[PDB]
Amino acid sequence: AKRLTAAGDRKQYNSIIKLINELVIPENVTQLEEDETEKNLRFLVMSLFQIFRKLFSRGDLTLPSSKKSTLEKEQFVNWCRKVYEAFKTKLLAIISDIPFETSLGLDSLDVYLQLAELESTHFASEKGAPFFPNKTFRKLIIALWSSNMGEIEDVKSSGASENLIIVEFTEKYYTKFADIQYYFQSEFNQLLEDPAYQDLLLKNVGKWLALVNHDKHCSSVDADLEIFVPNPPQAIENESKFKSNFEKNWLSLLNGQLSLQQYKSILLILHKRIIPHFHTPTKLMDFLTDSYNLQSSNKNAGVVPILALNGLFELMKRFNLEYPNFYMKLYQIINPDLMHVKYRARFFRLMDVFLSSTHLSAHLVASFIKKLARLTLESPPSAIVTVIPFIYNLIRKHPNCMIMLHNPAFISNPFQTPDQVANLKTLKENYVDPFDVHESDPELTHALDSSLWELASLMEHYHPNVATLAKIFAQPFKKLSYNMEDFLDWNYDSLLNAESSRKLKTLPTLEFEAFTNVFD
């Protein structure tokens, strides 16, 4: 209370290093008991927080004056007392972290950050080691992980988990400098040895996903983090050891106990948040091809081959080793599910490189574009917009496949004999298209003799931009290509945001006079 604040100010203004330690121990016992009592029961509106604020300022001044070091003549009271007081206050802050069913913005964060900064200053001031608070980072991450959620445990809408203390920690301490993430990732591996707590510490991984997956690391040059407290245990410049322990702890957590949403997200951004930061990112390839051959009839587990393709292509670009019989698998993988997935753009931004090959056949590209035409029969306009320039690019730079879209044996040309045009008539009477959709091999099906009616019928469409991007086959091929990665990130809300305004002068009357027939 206010009397505790006055006693703390008096015991900090006077040194008196017996009764000051006794009054600090009494106020610390009162602070721990009031924390366990008014922890969201009679919710502590800055009461224990103000007590810990006064105790943190007093312990900061006392640590700047005299802390546990080499003694004058065996100071078995003051140095041990300040050490026990600091340890008990940090353990009480960790206890308030581990027992917190609510969060009024200061349930554990202020006390934990104050004790962490005070431990860093105490290590760098006593100078007996270099960042020796990383041993207490074990119980720190144990508390900030065991700060369990009531109902926000891996919500099925966004992210992979929603833990306020973990996201505020990775905002305010874990990514404001550079070495404590390295020491955390090593001490996570030195944590995960006995099964007793790691059976809980491998339960729900999405909190660590939101904790580490931020693209702010030291091995990533996009945002380099600055210098920590001035006692270096060669920590930031040991990126190689950082990469190896990163790889080891990542494989140990990825071994078991997946949730489906966290599995989907970690497969969605495995290619960039995980792959380039390893010491030897080859230990993930069989996991990635198991995700690629993961074909269940479950409707959620069908996005799994789509998210695996980026990591698999990163692997094959890094060093050539294959998944065999590639293109009939890539043939069978696309369907209206794949066209109505959220990741049309993220799929086509790898489909263009996978289909820009030199060795593939006219048979393969013919089967691809005709089954894709039967696919784009049934699509939204945001799928027509992304599917038409890719197929135009492929039919342009594989110009033998124009035999589908054009046939010169069936032209209504004037200058030939009535015998020849009657032979044209009986040929267009007895002609049969040999296509079949259910054949899954591209070169074995008959897609060449079967023409492409589907985009010709897709010209007739209720959107003039789809009309002007669908008459490109009736018009000639004077234009080279269209900019897929500057063309493809368009959803329905972005499309309406695009044509909410334009060169705007549009008005027309309503003279239908068709009201009193069926007005519903």
């Binding site: 050539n320 080793l321 294959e322 065999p324 060795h359 056949s361 048979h363 070169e443």
Partner: protein
């Protein structure tokens, strides 16, 4: 007379008047013209053999 490598053939060379060597996919197949028949095939690769 035609000879059908089941994979799309990538290279056709001749090593003799009798037998030729054609490759497509992850195996190369030796054909003989006098027997008009495939008689060897080795597939000790990963991806398609290209020359």
């Amino acid at each position: 007379y035609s000879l059908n490598h089941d994979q799309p053939v990538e290279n056709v060379i001749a090593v003799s008047p009798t037998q030729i060597v054609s490759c497509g996919g992850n195996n190369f197949k030796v054909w003989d013209l006098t027997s008009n028949k495939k008689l060897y095939e080795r597939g000790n690769f990963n991806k398609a053999v290209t020359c």
